Design a protein around this ligand. Structure first.
Ligand SMILES: [Ca+2]
Ligand SMILES: [Ca+2]
Lengths: 244, 254
């Protein structure tokens, strides 16, 4: 079984450093890693993991993870990497292995992005100029809550843990990646958070443009999705089975 | 050049819009708009033709595919368009673009009832329900209702209703059959939500009303190793992320 280069980007609980002890090789865990193992175990290929030098997903030459692929320094790119047209142009993606959504972190009355966007008592924002910021903008100016969210968000934003922390010790809701948020919520030592749809796109696995693995990879991903296995894997990192 | 486009009639994905003496048929529909979007951007032209066997395609015991998927495997078509879902068995023999819309299972009911979900429909027996015998939905239901490793209470019920006599009681053998059974009798029809939705909307009497999540997606099938695969996905990604797709979607599902 040949060895493929896997480049990742830390993002809990998608890709995390599970082990890093002086004198030992770094080990990783997480939903994205599980999917890589499900594919490696079936297709019989092996691998070595390394993080994107800049800890960036990749923005237009290309930087970050996508860049590592465009410059053929990697073979696969496992991370909470969203499938977008620009990227799909420079690299090749599999099928989405999970749907990407925008969520809101609240502090222990709001129950939906709709309520969050009808009230003001609780200011709310995201990470300035980020993917989510642009998403709310783009939607907010279309031609019916997004418009009231943009009117609001567009002062109140910031740049990620800062937002997480705002909600914790102050009055503020944080709009951001829902899977990330949910994990943050579930695993909070004091259980001070609760989260609150739609899917504009999805998380993918990138391979270098014209890779011969894309096809069989997508097959295996679809099979894990349609068989119900993805869910067995999703519950491991996102279980509404207890704690908070 | 001109690309051969195969398809399967299905409302509102692909329908006949124009068919009048001494003229070539004209098709319309959500899937048709998407195809046009691709056609205009990549600037290619096509000629539409329907799946010889009116089926999306199943792996036949000869070791070859029939239906639409089959048209691509035998290189008779270049593009496959319709409410075709991206599935492992399929993607293994043909190349799919990224999904262009999500596929959810839904339920068609008759005005007067108050079933809020598949969960509810599952917890009552007063209104018998079902789907198409041996269809995709039939399988899914049987699969999740039979699984012992993870016993889904909902699907278990769903499953014992569907096969109440091995399928003779509540299953219809054609889409139209189940739809009409809801309207003229005591029956709930479990089918493709998008399809049932177009039917709910446009019912002349508004005697219908519909009600899950999605594990699949409808995709554009191309032939194994198609050169158009990558580029086709790029623009679908574009239409979705740029709210455009949502407009085409409000077109047939207002
Ligand atoms: Ca590409
Ligand atoms: Ca394929």
């Amino acid at each position: 079984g040949v060895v493929l280069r896997v480049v990742t980007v830390l993002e809990e609980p998608f890709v995390m450093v599970s082990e890093n002890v002086l004198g030992k090789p770094k080990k990783y865990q997480g939903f994205s890693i599980d999917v890589l193992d499900a594919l490696s175990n079936y297709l019989g290929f092996n691998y070595e993991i390394y993080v994107a030098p800049d800890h960036k997903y990749g923005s237009p030459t290309w930087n970050g993870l996508v860049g590592e692929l465009v410059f053929k320094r990697a073979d696969i790119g496992i991370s909470a990497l969203t499938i977008t047209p620009d990227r799909e142009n420079v690299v090749d993606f599999t099928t989405r292995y999970m749907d990407y959504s925008v969520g809101v972190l609240l502090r222990r009355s709001i129950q939906s992005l709709q309520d969050l966007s009808k009230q003001t008592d609780i200011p709310y924002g995201t990470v300035l100029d980020s993917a989510v910021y642009q998403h709310v903008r783009m939607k907010g100016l279309n031609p019916s809550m997004y418009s009231q969210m943009w009117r609001m968000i567009n002062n109140n934003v910031l740049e990620s843990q800062a937002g997480i922390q705002k909600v914790k010790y102050g009055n503020y809701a944080f709009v951001w990646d829902a899977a990330v948020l949910e994990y943050v919520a579930i695993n909070d030592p004091d259980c001070s958070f609760y989260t609150v749809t739609v899917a504009d796109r999805g998380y993918g696995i990138a391979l270098q443009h014209g890779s011969p693995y894309r096809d069989v990879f997508s097959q295996r991903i679809l099979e894990l999705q349609q068989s119900g296995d993805m869910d067995i894997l999703k519950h491991k990192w996102w279980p509404k089975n207890g704690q908070c």
